């Protein structure tokens, strides 16, 4: 039993809800919130900009130190950093950004990072401003993640479309 509420169950382990991930994380304070990161951990827009804003820029400060020490992530890769006031940990995961010409096949590799954590709150990787088809992202999620994932989707028409089209 966990404290996630109001989710539709899609499979044994994948759940979905129309929600603002910032407001969800503040309520649940999950062990792991997933950020839709880029390789530079520059949290400007989309989910990343919203999560960072909610931390009063502390996420960006921590991220800049991480990059200065370690260099950029790989597309498809991840790192674990603090969750600040939102969660215990933030798993920064880099899905391919189609608006940059990155290979969509890397989306499966990106979702594989979720399997290192028993329970996660997360957005659909490569959706929104990353320019991929969200129906595809949900399909890859369901077919790749084996741990318990609670997907937040900050758009009603999209959410309704994702539910009604889910196979
Ligand atoms: O990338 C996945 C979705 C895509 C957008 C919804 C339609 C375009 N983004 C988000 N999902 C959940 N919570 C969020 N908070 C701020 C942004 C955000
Ligand atoms: Cl987005």
We report the CATH number of the domain holding residue 126 as 3.40.220.10
**140 SS3 class:** helix
Instruction: Identify the DSSP state of 12.
Output: S
Q: Is 1 part of a structural domain of the chain?
A: no
Sign of the Cα torsion 65, 68, 71, 74 reads positive
Please enumerate in sequence order all residues whose Cβ is within 8 A of that of 113, keeping only pairs 6 or more positions apart, or say none.
77, 78, 91, 93
Q: Give the structural domain span for 42.
A: 8-163
Pairwise CA distance, residues 70 & 106, whole Å: 21
- Does 70 fall in a domain? yes
86 lines ligand 1 (CB under 6 A): no
Residue 66, domain member (yes or no): yes
Domain membership flag for residue 3: no
3-state helix, strand, coil in the chain (%, to 5): 40, 20, 40
| Cβ(96) – ligand 1 distance below 6 Å | no
CA 31, 119, 113, 38 torsion: positive or negative?
Answer: negative
How many domains in the chain? 1
Resolution of this structure in Å? 1.0
Can you say how many angstroms the Cα of residue 102 is from the centroid of all Cα atoms in its chain? 18
């Amino acid at each position: 039993v966990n404290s996630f509420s109001g989710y539709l169950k899609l499979t044994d382990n994948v759940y979905i809800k129309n929600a603002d991930i910032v407001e969800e994380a503040k309520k649940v304070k999950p062990t792991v919130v997933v950020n839709a990161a880029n390789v530079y951990l520059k949290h400007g827009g989309g989910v990343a900009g919203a999560l960072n804003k909610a931390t009063n820029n502390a996420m960006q400060v921590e991220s800049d130190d991480y990059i200065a020490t370690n260099g950029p992530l790989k597309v498809g890769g991840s790192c674990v950093l603090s969750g600040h006031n939102l969660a215990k940990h933030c798993l920064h995961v880099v899905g391919p950004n189609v608006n940059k010409g990155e290979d969509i096949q890397l989306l499966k590799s990106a979702y594989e990072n979720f399997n290192q954590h028993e329970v996660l709150l997360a957005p659909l990787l490569s959706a929104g401003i990353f320019g991929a088809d969200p129906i595809h992202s949900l399909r890859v999620c369901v077919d790749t993640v084996r741990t318990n994932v609670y997907l937040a989707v900050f758009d009603k028409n999209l959410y309704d479309k994702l539910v009604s089209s889910f196979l």
